[PDB]
Design a protein around this ligand. Structure first.
Ligand code: UP8
Ligand code: UP8
Lengths: 642, 642
């Protein structure tokens, strides 16, 4: 699935910056060219209209490099004359990707910094921008954000027609684009002028350094590399998203490499005074972060993880580590931002067809593929797991469902099995399988600044990303041969997460780790300011302002939402608090609002709605001080992609 | 563009599972050819256009779905594209003869009131039958869950079809009930004569009847047919959308039929005392509708027209004509709902290529196309009209822009010209042209029940529909050889309009026609309830409820929003009234809020927003009684398509 040129924007050569559009390709041409990776059409112009199957945006040639945004192109190839053109430049952090420009492409030249600027839009509109900083400009006449959509990668031209930068995000005030965020031309020059690798453990530097370990699978990033450090006489801390992983390392490292490491998890903590410690990011945060000179090296393992505890944890490490005398911080992952799933020699990859006795995600699994052996099937949801496991056992298959809220002992270590599991499997359970069958979808949460009155956390099913595919596919072919069976090829890009997750770090700061909103912003900032980690729109000021106003929460409701393990325990207990204090009903009577069930006979009238966390079925009032406070926060500059 | 089976929903206790039988490429290629040599299975099909995805259910050898999804489109099928056997815009229902090897479901006779809705995700929602077309959902669900499920079956416990899903019944974004096309409507449509002759004017009956006149372009439905009737000693009212056409018909009867008719328009009235009157819809409304015993026949010309005035004018006739001693109502149009664009023997139709020195909508116009002769070029906006007219005048073409605002004397009646016009040309100018060049797009208005705090009227560029395309093309080829140049062959289904048009009717009722919202409801209900006219979602109770609360309007602001001639003068002036009375700024200082400028340095604080009519730049307050009122109005059943 390449990126295709489907038209171009032609700029004027004299006087005022004007532009007109030309469409060179229809839908069929596009989808065919996307498949072949082969575009024999002659490139004209500096500004390309580009399309994937799912979205359309712009691209601008500058210094012989055809430039666009990471958030639109991923690490996809460009359809070219001799075939797919690989990306010469992928920079997730600057939101910038670049292809060697093909024959007959022309470049814009870099802008004597004028402050009178001109954004070329995808409908070839030329809108005036006033330069405000290195990467910002204000829209002279503010416009709706819809006006700027699909204009990512468009040029910001100064009056000479020279390029200042390429458009990457709109800055909003309650839905109106008041400014533009761009990728400067200087960032392109830095990208093209930077000298790499990251496959080997970093040597311990003389003074504090953050370093990256992009370890291949089966190279001992969590056992061999911390052991090796400890042999050199270093004190090392290994932080992992998973209790099951953390204990398995402890057990393996006591058994094989000699050291009986200290273990720090909720369920199990042991101090041996050995130079190595395996911890979860959760236990580490519960322990109050970095302690006085205990560690020389901090291995932040699975640093690709975008759950709130890993982001908070890594954030804490980065802000605290140097001051606590660490010499080195390692950000370790097999799958960094921008990385893509490529073939594995121990893994036969087999497209699931419509022939098979088990219907699976519009295609079909044959019974004889899962008749013999131990097999893992990924499903997006609890219901589908409970359904599939029932259908399969009915056909005489030893089918077990695993998902959150269940104990792992359900999965046998021993014999024939089909485990039907959500992504919960992967932090819950350490075992491998003879084949994996992957639905290639997952559940995600997305924020919407919906202004009805405030925001919505929206739950959705999305295409899986490169990190998902590779992690799930990697549950097979470990040391031996395996099969990987799928519904769709191709992934959405890796290394990006929603502003929803930032909200979720504040929620956890507040619910679990006794962090003020201010305290969490310092940690999250450390995470965002560090390059090479997953990336997010900076909504730190926004989210801090929301959580700052949520005061005098009911302790009891919060313990309940915490224990019940659902998303946003703070935000749920907090809405419940406002409801109970007003003797008002919850937004609905979904399982989310169960803390209120005792009170149900006493609760009447419209719910004082703070935000939307699901369907609102009851009538609403927007009069409450806290609704109003959260409505006022919505005035914050919100940088959103377009 | 055919509809394409891309999958199927296999049916069993009622359970369902889905199979995907086609990808995006296959869909595009199949949609282009109309040959789908894939074997049809099941009784529920998953189907697709370029834009939409929905369901089809087979009952009585007929493969049924929604008009709002499928339009008049052929179905890709084994030996090429299957043209639709049934089209019922009023019932929202289309049928194609089921392809061989495709099972039908048997109709449900035993009126069981426990029903089961089948979604496009193969889920089986319990639904309790309420009336003929409605079932209440046993567990209210967000509207988005039901998206893509139009044409899916409502099953009784037998497994027998009750009807097909067509719409969600919403309370503030939550589907609490479903609307469906029942099985009895399918039989009625089936049992109906496939072609009924509406070519010839009907006989005047002894008792009141409403009749349809579907007569070809050229057949004098506004001259020869009123003339013929009057020759029989009948009194005829001919209603037209256009002031220019109304005057023009009176100019032609004087000549070719020896009747000097009465003429009624805003600008000009003539009373000759004749048996024929030509009036505009708006003048007919200004006059106070139907006067008793004034007319025997009312011919509502151009009755496919979905402007607010024509809809209100037609409803007024349907409600008042019988009681005013009329015996016949003729609903007259060349383009009735469901009609498809067809070859015209006078019009050479030629697609624009990318070769040509005049960029136009991504394609190009050769200068040899428009150098010499008199041509009409249709653009969606006046900005595009001005750019193009400026470009062409540079090129040595004698071009002229025409739109709302401009006087039609800009267009020379003689000599070479290129007219660059919006659809405003249609009602303002009567002449024809050597060629028409069409952008195939138009500006429309769309309601969104956005709950931020109330509703939004959104302005959007949409593909044209068969009616528009016809109307635009029909400006060439009149009694001579035309050329018709286009950007795209795409054309949306005809005979449908948006809920904002209903809003527009109440607004015109209150601003212009001295109508209470209850009076507008009577009229719009006559229009809605009459079959064979354009169709709309029934939101009369909702709009009447909002408009009813808009009491004590500032007359000075209203006269101003009227004089200014822009849309929703009543809503605009009413928002202004509240801003002024609460001594607060307008939502912005866009042209729309010009009425407030005399008061600008006295006006401070948040806007009391009632609804959104464009971008809101100022901070907002929800405290106003009127705002709280319109919010209470939003709790009404809103029937929406998903
Ligand atoms: N594939 C693995 C499974 C468990 C542990 C490790 C490790 O970090 O040693 C690995 C590996 O990546 O080598
Ligand atoms: N194309 C027309 C132009 C003017 C008048 C008439 C008419 O109704 O007589 C027509 C027509 O379509 O017949």
């Amino acid at each position: 699935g390449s990126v295709v040129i489907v038209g171009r924007i032609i700029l004027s050569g004299s006087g005022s910056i004007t532009a007109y559009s030309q469409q060179t390709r229809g839908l069929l041409g596009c989808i065919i060219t996307s498949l072949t990776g082969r575009d024999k059409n002659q490139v004209e112009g500096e500004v390309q209209v580009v399309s994937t199957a799912t979205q359309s945006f712009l691209a601008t040639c500058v210094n012989g490099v055809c430039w666009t945004v990471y958030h639109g192109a991923g690490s996809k190839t460009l359809a070219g004359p001799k075939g797919p053109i690989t990306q010469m430049y992928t920079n997730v952090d600057q939101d910038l990707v670049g292809w060697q420009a093909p024959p007959g492409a022309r470049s814009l030249t870099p802008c004597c910094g004028s402050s009178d600027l001109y954004l070329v839009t995808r409908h070839a509109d030329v809108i005036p921008v006033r330069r405000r900083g290195d990467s910002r400009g204000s829209l002279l006449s503010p416009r709706p954000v819809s006006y700027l959509k699909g204009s990512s990668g468009g040029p910001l031209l100064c009056p000479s027609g020279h390029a200042v930068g390429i458009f990457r995000a709109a800055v909003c005030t309650r839905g109106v684009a008041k400014a533009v965020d761009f990728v400067p031309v200087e960032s392109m020059e830095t990208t093209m002028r930077s000298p790499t690798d990251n496959s080997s453990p970093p040597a311990v530097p003389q003074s504090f350094q953050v370093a990256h370990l992009h370890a291949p699978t089966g190279s001992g990033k969590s056992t061999k590399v911390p052991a090796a450090y400890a042999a050199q006489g270093y004190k090392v801390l290994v932080l992992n998203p998973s209790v099951a992983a953390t204990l398995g390392f402890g057990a393996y490292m006591s058994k094989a490499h000699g050291i009986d490491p200290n273990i720090r998890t909720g369920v199990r903590t042991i101090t041996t005074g050995a130079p190595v410690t395996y911890s979860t990011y959760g236990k580490f945060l519960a322990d109050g972060g970095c302690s006085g000179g205990a560690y020389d090296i901090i291995i932040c393992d699975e640093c690709h993880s975008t759950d709130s505890t890993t982001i908070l944890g890594i954030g804490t490490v980065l802000d605290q580590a140097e001051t606590a005398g660490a010499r080195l911080v390692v950000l370790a992952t097999a799958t960094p931002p921008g990385s893509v799933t490529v073939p594995h020699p121990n893994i036969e990859e087999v497209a699931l067809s419509n022939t098979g006795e088990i219907p699976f995600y519009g295609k079909a699994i044959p019974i004889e593929a899962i008749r013999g052996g131990r097999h893992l099937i990924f499903c997006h949801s609890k219901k589908k797991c409970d359904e599939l496991a029932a259908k399969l056992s009915g056909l005489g298959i030893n089918a077990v469902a695993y998902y959150r809220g269940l104990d792992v002992s359900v999965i046998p270590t021993i014999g024939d099995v089909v485990v039907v599991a959500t992504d919960a499997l992967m932090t819950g359970y350490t075992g491998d399988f003879d084949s994996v069958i992957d639905c290639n979808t997952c559940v995600t949460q997305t924020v919407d600044f919906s202004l009805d009155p405030t925001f919505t956390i929206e739950t959705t099913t999305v295409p899986q990303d490169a990190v998902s595919r590779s992690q799930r596919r990697g549950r097979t072919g470990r040391g031996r041969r395996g099969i990987y069976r799928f519904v769709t090829p191709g992934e959405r890009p890796s290394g990006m997460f929603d502003s929803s997750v930032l909200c979720e770090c504040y929620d956890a700061g507040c619910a679990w780790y006794e962090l003020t909103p201010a305290e969490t912003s310092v940690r999250l900032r450390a995470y965002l300011n560090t390059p090479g980690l997953p990336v997010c729109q900076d909504h730190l000021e926004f989210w801090e302002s929301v959580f700052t106003g949520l005061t005098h929460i009911d302790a009891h409701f919060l313990s309940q939402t915490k224990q019940a393990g659902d998303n946003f325990p703070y935000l749920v207990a907090y809405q419940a608090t406002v409801c109970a204090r007003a003797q008002a009903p919850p937004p609905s009577w979904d399982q989310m609002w169960k803390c209120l069930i005792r009170l149900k006979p006493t609760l009447h009238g419209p719910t004082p709605l703070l935000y939307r966390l699901g369907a609102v079925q009851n009538e609403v009032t927007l009069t409450h001080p806290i609704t109003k406070y959260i409505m006022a926060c919505m005035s914050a500059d919100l940088e959103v992609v377009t």
